[PDB]
Each structure stands twice: as C-alpha cells, then as structure tokens.
Write a protein that binds this ligand. Structure first.
Ligand SMILES: CC(=O)N[C@H]1[C@H](O[C@@H]2[C@@H](O)[C@H](O)O[C@H](CO)[C@@H]2O)O[C@H](CO)[C@H](O)[C@@H]1O
Length: 583
C-alpha cells in the first residue's frame, strides 16, 4: 500500500492538514461537458503512507469518440501542483506559514516523501477542429515502488458549438501588469529594459493574458504612483523633467516600447480601436509627482492639490503634450487617463480638466477609474467616466441599483467591470478556493457589467515559488501567475488554479452570451438562470484574511459555479437539438 491515488476537485486545494480525511478517497470516474475549442480541468490527488515514493508518473491515453474521431494525448497536459509557503495572514507577521498548492508546475516524474499529499493538475484542450461526441480515455499512475499501475475512467462530451475566440466576445478583462517586476526577477539591466532581452520574459505571460481575454493594458505616467505598496517599486514609464525655462518636458521612451510590444502581441490594436491603454494616474498617491530639475540639477517633487492652479497648470502641460505624442503615434483613441478613489472635489477637478483639453477634432481623453458606487439614480457624473470598475464589497447583495447603473452604461456604450482585491470574498488569493474565480466572473454578468478587472497579474514578491508572504494583504493577492525559476531556459511563468478558474468562468460566460445572441428565443430563460445567482456572505479568519462566512457559504460558491455552468450547457443542448430538428 505504498502509494494512494484518486480524482479530486479543482474547486479547492488538497492540503497536508487534511491528509487523514484525504487518504479515504476513491473516485475513479470523471465526466464533464465542453464545447469545440474549450478546455476542461481535473486533478488527481495522490498520497503516501509511512514510506517515500519515487518517480511517480501520470500518463494520458489518446481520447477517442463513438465515431473513432481522435483527440490525441498531446492535448492533455498533466502537471504537478507545486507547494509554496503563505502567511495566512493579512498584515500579521505572527500568523502561521502553511504550504498551499498554488502553482501549476511541470510534467514528468516527482518524488514524494512519507505521509505527504501531492496533487497533479490535468488540463484538456479541446482543439478548435474537434468533432462533437462523447470521448473516452484513461489516465494512468505508476511509480518505482509500485509493481503496478492505477487507472481512471475519463470521458468528456464535446458539444457541436465552437467556443468563441476572445475577439468575438464583448467580455472586458483588465489585469495590471508590472514589467519592471519581471525585469527585477530575471535580473534584466536598466540598459536592457524594453529591449528583446526583456521581451523574452514578458511575451509568454502576455500571450497567456491575451488568449484568456486580456484587453486592458496599464502604464504608469508618474513615479511610484502607488507609493511602493508592492514588493517592487513602480517606476514611471514617462520620465518628467523641469527645464531651465521652468516648464515640464517628458520622456515617453519606456511607455512607447511597452505599448508597442502589446500592439505587436495583439492585445491592443489602436487602428481598429481594440483594447485600452490605462494611464495611472492623474491622481497618484498624495498627488506626488517626482521629477529631475535641470535648472537646480536636483531630483525634486511636488504635491499639487486637485483644483489648485498649480495643479491645473501642471497637468495641462502633461495632458496637452501626452495628447500630441499619442496622436503622432496614432494611439490616442484607445488611451484612458486613470483616476482612483478620491473626494468628489478631486474627481470633479480631474474630469473638468480632461474634458477641457481637446485635439483639433474637439475630442478629449477617455477616463477610467475604480469607484465606490452603491446607491441608485444619479448618473450625471459617471456618464462622463468612460470605464469604471466597482469593488465587490461595495456592491449590494440584493438591490437592482448596480444592474440598472451597468445597463445605463451598456445603453451608452460605456465600459463597466467589477474587481476583487484585499478583504473581499469571493476573491483570487492563494488561500482562496479556486472556484471563487469562476463565481466572480458569473457575478460580473449577474450585474450586467462588461466583465472583470484585477490589479494583480504579476506583482511578485522575492521568491514567490517558495514563499508568497507579503506585509500587506491576503497572501498571493498581488499575482495571478508565478514566475519560472530564475535559471529557466524555456518557460517564463507558471499558471495557478485560481487563474485557471477565472479562465473557466470567462469561457463559460462567453458561452452564455453566445447563446443569447444566436438563440434570441432562449435569451430570457438564460437571463433567468444568470439572474438567479445566489451570493454568499463574507467572513474573516483569525488573522485578518477574508474567507467564507461559514461552510454553507463556502459550498454555495462551488454549488453555484457548477449550477450556472451546467444550466448553460443544457441551453447549449437545447439550441443544438432545435437546430438539427429544424434542419
Ligand atoms: C483596483 C484595485 O485593486 N486597487 C487597489 C485596491 O484598493 C481597494 C480600494 O480601491 C477599495 O475601494 O477598497 C479596498 C479595501 O481593501 C482596496 O483598498 O487594493 C489592492 C490590494 O489588494 C491594491 O492595493 C490595488 O492597488
């Protein structure tokens, strides 16, 4: 009995603390539904008893449907979930470290020590030319110490509908990227910033971003705009100078290469008007603008207050110059000046100034901002902000205030998202149930917004692979992907279960909206399934980290994710049946 094995949920983590409970498992069967061009995930949870085990390997057979059509084993990637330490933990250095299996790591062998849980992630890519049908296959588990092999009956049904490509949808996704963090971690030099040596470590993860739905691209326009909240500094992609004449000149060099990269990777297409450049921020931390004074040869700073005449003068110089620069590049139409949570005075000042400054064609900068909207009715001010993200904790569990607001914005063609961050449940922390990710995306469509935003693509601590612990926030909050190992030749990042569940959700809401468009007489019933979504309640654990109110609320998150997904594929079956019975 030297090695145990079973199928596990992807909805939650299999930890060491639940070893005893886990050792009693024996799910040998797995069945699920998917579309053509979709993906599915599963997990095989394994354990040892009082002996270590070596070269444990997982094998997938080809998958074959009822008509002999073949999805080869190359479309199934089985990857070890690597464990990493996490204080649990919000702003609390004494709370305990625990391993969490947050990292979708590598294929191939793995040694496991005595008395230890070890899980492998199974990702199944259904090719975009796959035939519909019910496919069948086997996943296998040997080791050295096993003179035998375990077997698992896997089947999935491919429905005769094609998963939309991100560009065929109207889902809006924005995850904030931190290219200088990538530079620090891979030891890229100042002089090699935003050259091909740097791009080699950005390109993989930014393609990952695009292929899941990524549309928004953040770019810093002043120095240290979030006051060094993150482990890494946030340098400005636009360097400010004050010349001998005492007016401000700007060096756009980094911004341009950053944006042009994203254009080259297909995330942004300024000519066709796709994607957003989010410029953070006209209201940076404490209004502090750092600059190199050429006159006094000193690094100096100023803190002009929004509305003040110095403030007006200064941002007028910046915005007028930035506009002209963007118009020369042909990027202006997709550029958004980002604001932040401030007083209505500060915000009214920002919007007044932005709407005043116009090009030769009487058009002004688009505006983006996270906000705190909750109570109904008044849209006179928000109708002036082009893209808004509302935090989860500032959304009412019951009222139609948000849905009406969002719908008003939808009627005018303005963007609206929701976001999660520290102190939210559901959220996308290391300690989260990954399913929370899928819920989150359903909630975005529950509220009739355009989708999801999060601040946390890649804000890595020192060595996230071994320890994710940071002095602020629930652990893993600042990053949805892990870096690869510093010496890596090949991979440049690792994905995570929580990210994979955000992807699932995005794929599934895209299904919903595809059905609504294509089968308009199934629409109202789809909307009813969506609008029947039930929101769980927020608790807090012993150390400041937001968690489910109770286990009833935990299981409700999982429950509802599955519920809406399955219901949505039943609508898919209805539209397919309807089609082939009318043919
Ligand atoms: C958009 C975003 O994620 N912003 C930061 C985020 O800030 C939010 C506030 O905007 C919101 O109103 O209140 C929250 C309370 O915890 C939170 O402060 O916080 C992130 C940290 O998880 C991060 O600092 C973002 O910069």
């Amino acid at each position: 009995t030297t090695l145990g094995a079973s199928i596990g949920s992807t909805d939650f983590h299999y930890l060491q603390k639940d070893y005893d409970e886990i050792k009693k498992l024996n799910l040998n069967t797995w069945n699920e539904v998917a579309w053509i061009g979709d993906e599915l995930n599963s997990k095989i949870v394994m354990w040892t008893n009082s002996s270590p085990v070596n070269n444990v390997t997982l094998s997938s057979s080809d998958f074959i449907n009822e008509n002999g059509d073949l999805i080869s084993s190359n479309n199934i990637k089985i990857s070890w979930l690597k464990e990493t330490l996490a204080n649990i933990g919000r702003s609390n250095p004494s709370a305990p470290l625990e391993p969490f299996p947050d990292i979708i790591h590598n294929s191939g062998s793995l040694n496991i020590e005595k008395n230890k849980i070890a899980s492998a992630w199974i990702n199944i890519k259904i090719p975009r030319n796959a035939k519909p049908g019910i496919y069948n296959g086997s996943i296998e588990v040997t080791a050295d110490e096993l003179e035998k092999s375990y077997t698992f009956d896997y089947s999935f049904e491919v429905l005769n509908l094609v998963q939309p490509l991100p560009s065929e949808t109207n889902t809006q996704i924005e995850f904030w990227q931190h290219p200088y963090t990538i530079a620090r971690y891979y030891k890229i030099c100042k002089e090699d910033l935003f050259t091909e040596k740097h791009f080699k470590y950005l390109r993989g993860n930014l393609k990952e971003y695009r292929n899941m739905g990524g549309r928004g691209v953040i770019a810093t326009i002043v120095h240290e705009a979030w006051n060094h909240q993150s482990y890494d500094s946030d340098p400005s992609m636009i360097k400010w100078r004050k010349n001998s004449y005492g007016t401000f000149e700007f060096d756009y060099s980094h911004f341009d290469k950053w944006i042009q990269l994203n254009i080259d990777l297909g995330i942004l297409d300024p000519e066709k008007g796709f994607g957003q450049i989010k410029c953070y921020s006209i209201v940076p931390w404490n209004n502090r603008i750092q600059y190199f004074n050429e006159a006094t040869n000193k690094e100096e700073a100023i803190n002009p207050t929004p509305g003040s005449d110095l403030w007006i003068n200064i941002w007028t110089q910046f915005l007028t110059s930035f506009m002209s620069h963007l118009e020369e590049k042909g990027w202006f139409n997709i550029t958004y000046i980002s604001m932040n949570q401030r007083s209505m005075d500060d915000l009214k000042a920002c919007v007044d100034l932005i709407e005043n400054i116009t090009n030769n064609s009487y058009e002004h900068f688009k505006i983006s901002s996270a906000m705190d909207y909750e109570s109904g009715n008044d849209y006179s001010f928000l109708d002036r902000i082009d893209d808004i993200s509302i935090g989860l904790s500032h959304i009412n569990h019951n009222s139609d205030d948000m849905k009406n607001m969002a719908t008003h914005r939808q009627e005018l063609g303005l963007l609206t998202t929701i976001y999660t961050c520290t102190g939210d449940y559901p959220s996308s922390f290391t300690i989260s149930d990954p399913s929370e990710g899928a819920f989150t995306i359903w909630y975005s469509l529950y509220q009739n917004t355009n989708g999801f935003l999060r601040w946390s693509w890649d804000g890595w601590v020192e060595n996230p692979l071994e320890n994710v612990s940071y002095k602020y926030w629930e652990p893993g909050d600042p990053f949805l992907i892990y870096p690869a190992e510093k010496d890596s030749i090949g991979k440049t990042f690792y994905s995570t279960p929580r990210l994979e569940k955000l992807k699932e959700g995005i794929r599934d809401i895209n299904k919903a909206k595809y059905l609504m468009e294509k089968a308009p007489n199934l629409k109202n019933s789809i909307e009813n399934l969506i609008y029947s979504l039930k929101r769980p309640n927020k608790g807090e654990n012993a150390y400041g980290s937001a968690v489910a109110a109770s286990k009833e609320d935990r299981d409700l998150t999982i429950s509802e994710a599955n519920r809406i997904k399955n219901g949505i594929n039943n609508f898919a079956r209805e539209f397919i049946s309807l089609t082939m019975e009318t043919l």
